[PDB]
């Protein structure tokens, strides 16, 4: 029955069911699975067969087809000519820096005819094309469906979400890439241009090789005035639309106007369409219009019948591919183009309004599936266009050819590996042209950071741009993109993560929807006349105008009825009825971002007590989220369908008899807290904070150190950070149990006292308890891993050994006794800066070492040393070094509310203030950090933490709970013997006098960030030098120097310290002396030991001047002289 006042548990139970049935990288997994299941098949099958002749004759030539289909894909395998091949464990790939890839196979049928009319076709099964990198936890990954015990047996983390590639033993994550939706008409109005309005519809076939062929239909911005032009792909100039229609095949004018204005009784449309009509009253038949288009083509034909064919080809294939490319699709293309013109006229008259570019209904997300499809298609075409070349090279002589040698298996696998390993998304030749940032290295510092990096979108618009409109949070981001979570750098709003229940559609064929549609009462375009098209409604399927229906109602209900039972229409498909404007659109393509919503009838939910009961007893009745969807209780609603629907925040508070607001709801939200992301779902009371605080906390949640993964000891990984004693927060949101934050937490529930104790926390800093740090408070250990491989020439063989002084020539003062005789350190040996770790020497044509030295000022201990063979069969070693990081002053600490700060001082327990009991705060922060930041959520967290630690319960900090507030928390606290507002009477730790003011104190969940001070502190005193210009090197690792930049130079000018400026830029960087002739200001030649100073070109040898110069200045002068410029510097 109806469920009253049990919502606070029913909604979270169904949310738990959703997060049990679907994981957190479900979009990644589904996209990659759909790719490797069907998109690779369609890409490999739709490629045309290649037929190839000889060089047109031999004396005074037959061909073959070579068509292939039916792709086969196998599980990952690993060994080559050394043993029988065995499956690749992903952990083995990580350790050995392999590429966790899977070989794909096809069977080819080459049918060849030569002479005598005898056809023989030979089929080659399981032909090898390459090895495709495969995503972890995918449907063909070796970890698919394995139980937690098996995953632990394989040294894999059961909590690892997967969704990433292992390539060269490095995790790669395909960041989702935004783009404008395809096959849809957008009417825009750019401000400063020759034309006022422009309507574009970038078009794509069902994943064809052709790119987005974008067509614009535009209207001029002011004789006659307001002509309509349509710039066309592969056409240099704009073409008036009526000429386009006449070229398409409509000789008359009434027929053309029947495709644009659907109701002839509207004269306002005619008054604006006739200025374009009277522009082209000189073309009356199809061929002259074809000639007109061909003259404007990029490749202008020399004769008339060549322009005719070129323009016919352009109209047949380039323009509007999604509406069809076949023998006769002229009527459908004309209908769609007339619809585009009608859409432009509606915006020109103001009957409708301009479409919004930031409306994420108009956006599509390119996940792993679509991205790998786009890149594999190009590489596959490149493979075919080299099989063809090999075939030509053998058939010109005509002896025979072998497809096994013809197939170059390197290209596909190497292209995939390069693209995913580097991020340059495209061919390697166009490294600068291809967009970068895709397939980033997975951030593996915290589990929340890993989840956030696996759920991340990207807007491929240029950064450092002054147009803030794309960066702004759009209204259509509700519940699909986290409003709080975004980087604070130059990528604000451009890089945005994914909401919790937000799911990205994976795509399916619209054909079943088409056969379902064509059988109720609708008519295809070819059947009807435009007489009855004005009163009825236009149906769009994936953006292509399929037909016309007289009754929009009871077909909308029918489509919703089928989608709610999953009869023919799958759940991801979205049906959208625009009502004031008669379009009714159906979308099935991939990349549509959507989230689940409840179904609401008259004023009641379809979710019932019976649903909640049979789903609460899950793991026995297996009534999962999929069964809940099949029950017709929830739907997946994308942004398009979210425009035409009416939601309610809470069924109890928004579906009741009262002063009526809507009384016509259609959907309800499961819980509003699901609009947050992953890093923002760990914020307690996030609605009690200023939003920039929440953004900063979402950014710093990726930097808080903790147990980032369970198998961190088998995981030989560089820059690994784990905390000794992580704790789940005393006060938590109900959304953490789905992020598994209470299983892999990053932080300790510290007792903070928000007070000004001594002044060492004044400017946003913090005091720590030295005794707590001694007891292990926020103590962590830093793992750094070092890799090395021996090899590279004919005789320069790399080898691991202990370099011996009399044998090897080049050696540091570092002691090499710590090495074992095989050239490595045994694990468990204390190490420090400038200590050899891997003794590697190269033969000198006696020997020279290439030993790896421990990074300066690390001073850790070797944890474990692994030796193995890379994919080239050479010895490969990785060494991991432990180094614990005791919290010292300057280490960056932060809370769950964007209140960051470095430790300012550490007092012992005696020096630290204390309550009536012996409770001394672990942390003291400045109260002057609250009032401007307005992190009232921090104060409420500090209060609820005390309440929870006294009650024995775990505090609940769900954002929009509305069942807990400050008054209730205070009343609960007052029962345990404390002041109701959390204040306590602390005593001064030094004098013992009780502090006149009462101190606000309580347990708060603080986090330790990776930004330690020992990893940032560095100095320099005449260290190493760069090679090109003799200035100090750059970087902390290279013992570099700080940059006395152009603004510091200006500041010194303003100080008027000219001697200090010269000291900084000349002696402290690169003092240098050069010899210049007094006659010509050109640099001369100086031989100091013989004191022979001659300037050739003058033959003086006598009057020569020495001038002191920065080396950068000398090298600038030399570059100018190389550019034939003659900077002459006379000292007179």
């Amino acid at each position: 029955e109806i469920t009253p006042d049990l919502w606070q548990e029913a909604c979270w139970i169904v949310i738990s069911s959703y997060f049990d049935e679907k994981g957190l990288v479900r979009q990644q997994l589904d996209s990659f699975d759909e790719f490797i299941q069907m998109s690779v098949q369609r890409i490999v099958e739709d490629a045309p067969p290649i037929d190839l002749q000889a060089e047109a004759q031999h004396a005074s030539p037959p061909r073959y087809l070579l068509k292939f289909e039916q792709i086969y894909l196998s599980k990952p395998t690993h060994w080559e000519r050394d043993g029988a091949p065995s499956p690749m464990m992903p952990n083995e790939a990580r350790l050995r820096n392999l590429t966790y890839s899977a070989p794909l196979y096809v069977d080819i049928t080459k049918t060849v005819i030569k002479e005598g009319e005898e056809q023989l076709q030979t089929q080659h099964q399981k032909t090898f094309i390459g090895k495709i990198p495969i995503m972890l936890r995918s449907t063909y990954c070796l970890l698919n469906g394995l139980t937690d015990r098996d995953l632990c047996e394989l040294n894999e983390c059961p909590l690892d979400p997967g969704g990433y590639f292992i390539i060269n033993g490095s995790e790669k994550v395909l960041i989702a890439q935004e783009k404008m939706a395809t096959n849809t008409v957008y009417v825009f109005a750019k401000k400063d241009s020759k034309y006022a309005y422009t309507g574009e519809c970038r078009s794509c076939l069902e994943n064809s090789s052709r790119p987005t062929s974008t067509i614009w239909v535009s209207m001029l911005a002011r004789a006659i005035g307001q002509r309509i032009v349509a710039t066309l792909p592969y056409i240099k100039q704009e073409v008036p639309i009526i000429i386009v229609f006449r070229a398409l095949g409509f000789v008359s004018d009434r027929d053309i106007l029947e495709h644009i204005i659907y109701d002839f009784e509207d004269p306002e449309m005619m008054e604006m369409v006739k200025p374009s009509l009277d522009e082209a009253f000189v073309i009356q038949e199809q061929n002259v219009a074809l000639n007109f288009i061909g003259s404007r083509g990029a490749k202008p034909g020399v004769t008339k019948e060549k322009r005719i064919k070129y323009a016919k080809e352009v109209l047949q294939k380039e323009m509007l591919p999604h509406v069809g490319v076949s023998d006769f699709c002229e009527t459908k293309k004309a209908y769609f183009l007339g619809y585009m013109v009608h859409r432009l006229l509606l915006a020109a008259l103001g009957r409708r309004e301009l479409d919004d570019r930031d409306h994420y209904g108009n956006k599509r997300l390119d996940l792993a599936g679509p991205l790998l499809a786009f890149l594999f298609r190009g590489m596959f075409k490149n493979l075919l266009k080299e099989v063809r070349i090999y075939a030509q090279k053998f058939i010109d002589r005509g002896k025979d050819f072998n497809l096994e040698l013809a197939i170059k298996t390197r290209i596909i696998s190497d292209g995939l590996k390069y693209s995913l390993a580097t991020g340059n998304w495209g061919d390697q030749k166009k490294a600068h042209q291809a967009r970068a940032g895709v397939s980033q290295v997975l951030n593996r510092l915290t589990f929340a950071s890993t989840l956030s990096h696996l759920r991340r979108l990207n807007s491929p618009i240029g950064r450092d741009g002054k147009l803030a409109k794309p960066r702004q949070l759009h209204n259509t981001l509700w519940g699909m993109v986290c409003p709080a979570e975004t980087p604070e750098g130059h990528a604000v709003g451009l890089v945005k993560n994914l909401a919790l229940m937000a799911y990205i559609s994976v795509g399916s064929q619209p054909s079943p929807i088409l056969e379902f549609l064509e059988e109720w009462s609708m008519e295809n375009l070819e059947e009807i006349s435009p007489a009855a098209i004005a009163d009825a409604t236009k149906i769009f399927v994936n953006g292509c105008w399929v037909g016309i229906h007289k009754d929009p109602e009871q077909l909308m209900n029918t489509l919703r009825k089928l989608r709610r039972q999953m009869d023919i229409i799958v759940s991801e498909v979205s049906m959208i009825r625009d009502i004031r404007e008669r379009e009714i659109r159906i979308y099935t393509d991939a990349g549509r971002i959507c989230r689940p919503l409840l179904i609401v009838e008259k004023q009641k939910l379809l979710l019932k007590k019976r649903h909640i009961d049979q789903l609460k007893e899950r793991e026995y009745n297996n009534y999962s989220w999929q069964d809940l969807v099949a029950s017709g209780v929830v739907e997946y609603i994308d942004t398009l369908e979210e425009e035409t629907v009416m939601l309610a925040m809470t069924p109890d508070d928004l579906q009741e008899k009262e002063v009526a607001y809507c009384s016509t709801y259609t959907h309800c939200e499961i819980h509003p807290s699901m609009i947050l992301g992953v890093c923002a779902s760990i914020i307690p009371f996030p609605d009690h904070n200023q939003s920039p605080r929440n953004t900063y906390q979402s950014a710093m949640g990726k930097q808080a150190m903790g147990v980032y993964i369970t198998n961190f000891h088998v995981r030989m990984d560089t820059l690994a950070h784990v905390l000794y004693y992580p704790q789940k927060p005393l006060v938590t949101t109900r959304s953490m149990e789905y992020l598994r934050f209470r299983e892999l937490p990053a932080g300790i529930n510290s007792i903070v006292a928000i007070a000004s104790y001594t002044g060492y926390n004044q400017e946003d800093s913090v005091i720590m308890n030295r005794s707590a740090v001694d007891r292990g408070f926020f103590r962590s250990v830093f793992y750094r891993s070092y890799k090395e491989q021996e090899s590279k020439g004919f005789d320069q063989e790399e080898v691991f050994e202990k370099p011996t002084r009399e044998t090897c020539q080049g050696m540091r003062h570092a002691i090499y006794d710590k090495l074992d005789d095989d050239g490595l350190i045994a694990p468990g040996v204390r190490v420090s800066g400038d200590d050899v770790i891997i003794g590697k020497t190269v033969t000198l044509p006696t020997k020279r070492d290439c030993s790896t030295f421990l990074r300066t000022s690390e001073t850790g201990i070797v944890d474990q040393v692994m030796v193995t063979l890379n994919q080239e069969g050479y010895k490969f070693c990785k060494i991991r070094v432990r180094s614990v990081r005791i919290p010292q002053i300057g280490d960056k600490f932060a809370s769950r509310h964007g209140q960051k700060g470095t430790c300012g001082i550490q007092y012992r327990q005696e020096d630290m203030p204390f309550t009536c009991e012996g409770i001394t705060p672990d942390i003291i922060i400045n109260p002057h950090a609250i009032p401007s930041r307005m992190t009232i959520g921090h104060l409420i967290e500090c209060l609820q933490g005390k309440v929870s630690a006294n009650k024995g319960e775990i505090g609940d900090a769900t954002p929009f709970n509305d069942a807990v507030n400050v008054q209730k928390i205070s009343n609960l606290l007052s029962d345990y013997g404390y002041h109701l507002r959390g204040n306590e009477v602390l005593y001064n730790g030094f004098t013992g006098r009780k502090i006149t003011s009462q101190i606000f104190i309580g347990p708060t969940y603080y986090q330790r960030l990776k930004h330690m001070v020992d990893d940032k502190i560095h100095s320099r005193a005449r260290g190493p030098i760069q090679i090109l210009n003799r200035q100090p090197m750059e970087g902390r690792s290279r013992d570099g120097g700080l940059r006395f930049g152009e603004m510091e130079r200006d500041c010194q000018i303003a100080h008027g310290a000219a001697q200090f400026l010269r000291e900084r830029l000349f002696e402290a960087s690169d003092p240098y002396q050069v010899h210049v002739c007094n006659l010509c200001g050109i640099m001369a030649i100086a031989n100091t030991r013989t004191h022979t100073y001659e300037c050739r070109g003058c033959r003086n040898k006598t009057q020569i001047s020495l001038v002191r110069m920065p080396y950068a200045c000398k090298l600038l002068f030399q570059e100018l002289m190389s550019m034939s410029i003659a900077p002459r510097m006379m000292s007179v």
């Binding site: 040294n155 147990v707 088998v714 704790q727 927060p729 007891r775 672990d922 630690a949 024995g952």
Partner: protein
């Protein structure tokens, strides 16, 4: 990972209380009754067990490096 030996704030020994705390929770005892059955009167010591996540059990599921 593992329960700390001493409370960070107080310094009272908490390292021996984790197994007994789990045993008490393996009964009708709530957390609030188990904590003060173990003798944790201050919330500084109470949070040490109340908010502790015992990851050593998840760590032990992996086979060791040696035998």
């Amino acid at each position: 990972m593992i329960i700390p030996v001493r409370c960070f704030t107080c310094g009272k020994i908490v390292g021996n209380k984790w197994e007994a705390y789990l045993g008490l929770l393996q009964a009708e005892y709530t957390e609030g009754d188990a904590l003060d059955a173990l003798g944790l009167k201050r919330y500084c010591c109470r949070r040490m067990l109340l908010a502790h996540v015992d990851l050593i059990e998840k760590l032990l599921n992996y086979a060791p490096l040696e035998k």
